């Protein structure tokens, strides 16, 4: 007759921190929780091109002078678009199923979903990092950001954190895929994920991207340099506009002669703001063992938004996790 | 707060037929009928706002290529996604076919389906883009909220190419092969919507359908090969091109992840009340043909503040997207 209480979590963050490991443990019968893995097979094997080696190979052939730059920036953008696809497909498939009545009930849910990354990772975070590093243009970044899907009510995002030394240790330990392992990339990603956390805190504080936009300095070469510096950003209690994702958009490329952002670009920021609204944000330190890491995330559950879904939707969710694990190489 | 009834129309179709001219006439007070707001093609976004001109860029690419082409097609979609995100908060709900004249009409020059689906599909069919690239684009189609109407422009190909010629320099070539394919693709679009409106789903006839290989792609680029169907079958729709080996397992069964992509496409198109409109008349007559469809179109219930925001949006988009 009645409803299933669901809490959904997107575990997200810089690669190499331990998010996937944590997610599998949480889902393990050793501790009812479903886990949706990174869509590895979609990225690597389902098509003729592997996007992870492709994106690194592009910067390699950029360095070796075989790729004219210019073209590299365009190809880099295209590989980055391909990362998003399976996230967009999964989000489209699951978003009808969670149900409504988002509330912080403080109870154990009937069903917990753990998604490995939210779409914001491939549409915003990784693209923003590539932009800040000079691997991609603002135009290419806009193109990715515009494809972010709106999160419906009840979303929770848990951004993983880890001290730099242990992060480097762990990056050393991942299997060889042909992935780009670059400490400037890592530094930048780490800063961008703090910007994300800060954006969410900024919005929940009742502010909007125009609040402090005037007084904000133009974000040019100097801004980009600082965003690539290890530990230049951190999670803030009350963030400033300058601590969020919005700040990197106050660049000359996006303003008229008189210094004023075009309305069409302002719309792009309004959209970004609205799409993040339903993400209840948390951070989790992963310095512990896998078991302690999962416990850290689990201790957040009673703080999270739950929705009310019906039996048939919850069943479709179980089938979705089963299918996705199977087809993605779990 | 005071209630306002809106009909919105995405006028769409192959470039060169007369869509933009028609929409400008509709917006003009001289066409009478309903007070109409027109949203043009995002020309400046494509051509002048950034360093790279994507129109020149995509055509120059064909003159690694497959990846650059996919990225240019991505950039076409951007301003459409932004505009759709902005305006969808203003249309309101309570979609119905009311039969009566709305308080105002919106005319959008193209729907997001053009840049995320139709043009990518044409490029894929011509071997200029991979299926993987096509999926990437299709996945970014936004869901149409209740009350959308789409009008696909049609025109005999002879007059279509004539229109492109008048406008073209005095020795400038026309990509006849691309235009031939896009005309078929837009018929597939029309057929897809008719197909969905009849309560059918992409799975209907999927098994019986031949895999869409070399022969399918030949037919798809063939001038006049497709048309608007009274009663479309699956093979007349956009769904058919997706039954390809690239998307199937060993047993020739579509992977569930790809099936989900097709479900999403199907749902995203649901709220598009579909029409076609012949544009062989003068611009005044073309505007009248499109406007005569209003009694059959969905309208929504918005309000004065949101309608006012739509007028500002139209004013702004027209200004910022110009030359
Ligand atoms: N809690 C942990 N303690 C020690 N090593 C870990 C821990 N979590 C993950 N690792 C190791 O670090 C590497 C990256 O972990 P992974 O789960 O792939 O990170 P992510 O999913 O964040 O990219 C793997 O080699 C993994 O075995
Ligand atoms: N109704 C019409 N009759 C004759 N020529 C037309 C008509 N409508 C448009 N044209 C011309 O045809 C060309 C294509 O028109 P345009 O409105 O740009 O088409 P589209 O928006 O479909 O790409 C233009 O040169 C235009 O002046
Ligand atoms: C999600 C995502 C991952 N990656 C990279 C980081 C890792 O090397 C690998 C798996 O996350 O793919 C991107 O380059 N872009 C993305 O959008
Ligand atoms: C909307 C759209 C237009 N075009 C081209 C066709 C015309 O030459 C020009 C303007 O519509 O841009 C694309 O290549 N892709 C697209 O997605």
Swiss-Prot record, chain B:
Give the matching InterPro entries: Herpes_TK, P-loop_NTPase
Q: Which UniProt keywords apply?
A: ATP-binding, DNA synthesis, Early protein, Kinase, Nucleotide-binding, Transferase
Q: Name one GO biological process term.
A: DNA biosynthetic process
Positions annotated as active site in the UniProt record? 41
One Pfam family per UniProt: Herpes_TK
Membrane-spanning segments: none
Q: Which residues bind ATP?
A: 13-20, 163
Q: Which residues bind substrate?
A: 59, 73, 76, 119, 169
Molecular function terms, GO-annotated: ATP binding; thymidine kinase activity
In short, the EC number is: 2.7.1.21
Q: Which reaction does it catalyse?
A: thymidine + ATP = dTMP + ADP + H(+)
* Entry annotated with the keyword Acetylation: no
Q: Which domain of life is it from?
A: Viruses
What does the UniProt function comment say about this protein? Answer: Catalyzes the transfer of the gamma-phospho group of ATP to thymidine to generate dTMP in the salvage pathway of pyrimidine synthesis. The dTMP serves as a substrate for DNA polymerase during viral DNA replication. Allows the virus to be reactivated and to grow in non-proliferative cells lacking a high concentration of phosphorylated nucleic acid precursors.
Assigned protein family? Belongs to the herpesviridae thymidine kinase family.
Quaternary structure (record): Homodimer.
Name assigned to this protein: Thymidine kinase
């Amino acid at each position: 007759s009645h409803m299933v209480t669901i809490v959904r979590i997107y575990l997200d963050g810089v690669y190499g921190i331990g998010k996937s490991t944590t997610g599998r443990v949480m889902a393990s019968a050793a501790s009812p929780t479903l886990y949706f893995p990174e869509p590895m097979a979609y990225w690597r094997t389902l098509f003729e091109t592997d996007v992870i080696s492709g994106i690194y190979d592009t910067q390699n052939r950029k360095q070796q002078g075989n790729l004219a730059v210019d073209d590299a920036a365009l190809i880099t953008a295209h590989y980055q678009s391909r990362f998003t696809t399976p996230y967009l497909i999964l989000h489209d498939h699951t978003c009808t199923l969670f149900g409504g009545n988002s509330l912080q009930r403080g109870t154990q849910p009937d069903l917990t979903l753990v998604f490995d990354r939210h779409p914001v990772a491939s549409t915003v975070c990784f693209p923003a990092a590539r932009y800040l590093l000079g691997d991609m243009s603002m135009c290419a970044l806009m193109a990715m950001v515009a494809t972010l899907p709106r999160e419906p009510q009840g979303g929770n995002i848990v951004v993983t954190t880890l001290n730099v030394e242990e992060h480097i240790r762990r990056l050393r330990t991942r299997a060889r895929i042909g992935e780009q392992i670059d400490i400037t990339l890592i530094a930048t990603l780490r800063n961008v994920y703090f910007m994300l956390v800060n954006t969410c805190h900024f919005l929940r504080s009742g502010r909007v991207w125009r609040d402090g936009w005037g007084e904000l300095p133009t974000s040019c070469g100097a801004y980009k340099h600082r965003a690539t510096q290890m530990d230049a950003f951190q999670e803030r209690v009350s963030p400033e506009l300058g601590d969020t994702l919005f700040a990197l958009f106050k660049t000359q490329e996006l303003l008229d002669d008189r210094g004023v952002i075009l309305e069409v670009h302002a719309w792009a920021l309004d959209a970004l703001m609205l799409k993040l609204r339903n993400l209840n944000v948390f951070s989790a330190d992963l310095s512990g063992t896998p078991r302690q890491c999962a416990a850290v995330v689990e201790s957040l559950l009673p703080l999270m938004s739950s929705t009310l879904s019906d039996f048939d939707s919850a069943s479709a969710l179980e089938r979705a996790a089963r299918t996705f694990n199977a087809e993605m190489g779990v």
